């Protein structure tokens, strides 16, 4: 079980990683197997609460969403050794949806044609000795899958 492989380089919240696990901390809240999924990304301490059913916010709507029927748990520890997040998006993200596109966000009537400027902004915004709330908090989420078939855990 490569649980030590999950906990040098991490991925941003907008590009969160999921890993297929089979046949094997400041915040720890459980809510709820054939399959278990390891979600690893990073958000600041303010947005840790976004990883929960019944959520609203920049991370919840446009970066990472929980299915409101979560049968799993959320793991996270303190300040991070070594980050992007999606700020501009037209619609809310679906549960477990991942958005990679870097297309210029069109906030006006005229289109952008890939050029940043008036009413045309990059959807992704860049994230020591500051408030720990705004310091990165690595977040690990485990999703449990249970269907009518042989289990693998």
């Amino acid at each position, epitope marked *: 079980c490569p649980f030590g492989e999950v906990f040098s380089k991490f991925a941003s919240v907008y590009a969160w990683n999921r890993k297929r696990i089979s046949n094997c901390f400041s915040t720890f809240k459980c809510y709820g197997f054939t399959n278990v999924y390891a979600d690893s990304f990073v958000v600041k301490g303010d947005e840790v609460r976004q990883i929960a059913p019944g959520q609203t916010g920049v991370i919840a709507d446009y970066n990472y969403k929980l299915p409101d029927d979560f049968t799993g748990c959320v793991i996270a520890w303190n300040s991070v050794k070594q980050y992007l997040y999606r700020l501009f998006r037209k*619609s809310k993200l679906k549960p477990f949806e991942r958005d990679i596109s870097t297309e210029i966000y069109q906030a006006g009537s005229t289109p952008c044609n890939g050029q940043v400027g008036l009413n045309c902004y990059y959807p992704l915004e860049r994230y020591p000795t500051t408030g720990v709330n705004y310091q990165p908090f690595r977040v690990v989420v485990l999703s449990f899958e249970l269907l009518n078939g042989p289990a693998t855990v």
Partner: antibody
Amino acid sequence: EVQLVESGGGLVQPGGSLRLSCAASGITVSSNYMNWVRQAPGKGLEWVSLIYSGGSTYYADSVKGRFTISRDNSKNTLYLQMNSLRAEDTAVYHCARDLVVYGMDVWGQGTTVTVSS
Amino acid sequence: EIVLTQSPGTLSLSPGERATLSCRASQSVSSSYLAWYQQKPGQAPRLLIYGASSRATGIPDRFSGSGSGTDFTLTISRLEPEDFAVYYCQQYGSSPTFGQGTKLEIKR
């Protein structure tokens, strides 16, 4: 072309209801963070409501359970439904485009709301 | 929540002087969520500085932002006669909040 115009303000007795209209041109209401910021006579700017591009709506503690903010795609108009209007709500209401990191760059002249019997 | 306090209530200077505007944050806060606004009488607020020291488009270079942590400073290097207005500082968190504002009057 890029401009915000407010309308719908008027005279409302205490405990009444009123709805404000913020017509937008040049910018799309549904694609931007929309904010309502009011200013009491002789006082400073006070944030009121916030609607996300994805539909999430945020409100201040003093306006919780009383104020609701909506929008119209077909009209490109931002709405703010106000209920249980106390004397605190006598102010001029502006609608502004909110770039979160980049601040609020576009502001309208606003409309006037007075709460008095 | 985030509370912003501006000091002092009224700043009294004369044209050609340097204005040091202070906005105090009761808690340590991000340096990219602060905006400085100028509001002349009978007009809508105008954004001057976003983030911490970034000027908005069309803002004259005499306006300068600074500060980090809990203390931030808005600086006008040379005061033009039409720079006398009320200046506000803003922070966001989850819901935007504003300070009470500082009035710039003419020294006499």
